[PDB]
Amino acid sequence: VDPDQTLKACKALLAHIKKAAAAPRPDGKQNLLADEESTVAETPIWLTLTTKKHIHDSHRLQPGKIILPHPLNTSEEISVCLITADPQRFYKNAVADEFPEDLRAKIGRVIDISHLKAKFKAYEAQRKLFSEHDVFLADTRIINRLPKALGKTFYKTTTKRPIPVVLMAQRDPLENANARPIPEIVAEIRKAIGAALVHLSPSTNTAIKVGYANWEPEKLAANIETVIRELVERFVPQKWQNVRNFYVKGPETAALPIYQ
RNA sequence: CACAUUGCGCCCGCCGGUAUUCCGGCGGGCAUGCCUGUUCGAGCGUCAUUUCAACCAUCAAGCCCUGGGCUUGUGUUGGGGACCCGCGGCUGCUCGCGGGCCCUGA
């Protein structure tokens, strides 16, 4: 790779995104819930990794976590749902009382598997939950049972797949619930929410969201370059031999080649 | 029960006479309509009965630079939208695998 031309790939895209959003709508009626700054801010950007062989033999519904120098979810209007195994009442008190105030506001709701498996069975119920929140996380004890309880409303879109977390301190839920020390859970949850995700789909194309169109091109370039180093070093088999074109994609724009 | 005669039935117990069987006597009870409840029933009066449940890993195994992190545990309803792509065939049009956006009651 190279930084300078990858960087020149960056502001080449945001320039096209900025002019696309600022362009007036031809039919003459504007959007009542869309500001030209807001639409640019909400527009994500993706890097599309192409290979010459499968990343995985089959679909992997537990995504991989790649830490970034600049975390992704930092907007104020981000609501997060946490899924647990122990009594959700315990985590509700844990959320309410012993918990930082900045990341309380980003918590939407916490629900155990039992309440998840009872209320959200119908497809509308899991679609209502799917649309209401932005990102989801679940304890590794339960992440295996989530595909059945959530259906294809979560594991076909592939965008809002839940993120695994480890509430392993080292049976009657009502007796006692093993739990990690609270101050380092909130470090883990903050770590998990801001970590980019890679979906080990069977195909030879993996798209990763590494920022938005309101980010500075240099900070976006730093985010993309560390994903490129990490992802090839850990996930794709055969490392550099299996890797191929690296396209930067806008959700409504074209692709920007970067050949490795 | 009987014009009521100090006569005669049925049930439980007792007493005195040779007494488990006989005799006599004594004590407690046995009318009708109706109400509340109890228990025992009757009815080709009506109904239900061949059970749509729960039941993956609410943690295990292996590791590393000894305490945090890592890997494996394959688990998804269907359909539609002159929308934006990656990769393979197709001389080509196009078709397949996988994505991003949107809609819909299992």
In short:
The protein is of the alpha/beta class. Helices cover about 35% and strands about 20% of the residues.
Please give the number of β-strands: 10
- In DSSP terms (H or I, runs of 4 or more residues), the helix count works out at 10
Radius of gyration: 20 Å
Name the helicity range.
25-40%
Distance between the termini: 6 Å
Basic shape: globular
Q: Secondary-structure element order, as H and E? A: HHEEEHHEHHEHHEHEEHEE
Class based on secondary structure composition and strand pairing:
alpha/beta
Beta fraction: 15-25%
Biggest sheet: strand arrangement: 8-1-9-10
> Main sheet?
4 strands, antiparallel
PDB class: ribosome
Keywords: Ribosome, Ribosome biogenesis, pre-60S ribosome
Entry title: Cryo-EM structure of a Chaetomium thermophilum pre-60S ribosomal subunit - State Puf6
Name: Ribosome biogenesis protein C8F11.04
Describe the structure in your own words:
The protein is an alpha/beta fold and 260 residues long. Helices cover 37% and strands 19% of the residues. The chain is built from ten helices and ten strands. The chain has helices at residues 3-22, 36-42, 88-96, 101-104, 113-119, 123-132, 146-150, 152-155, 182-193, 217-234; strands at 44-51, 64-66, 80-84, 107-112, 135-139, 163-165, 196-198, 205-212, 243-249, 255-256. The strands form three sheets. The protein has a four-stranded antiparallel sheet with strand order 8-1-9-10, with helices on both faces. Strands 4-3-5-6 form a four-stranded parallel sheet. Strand 9 and strand 10 (255-256) form a beta hairpin.
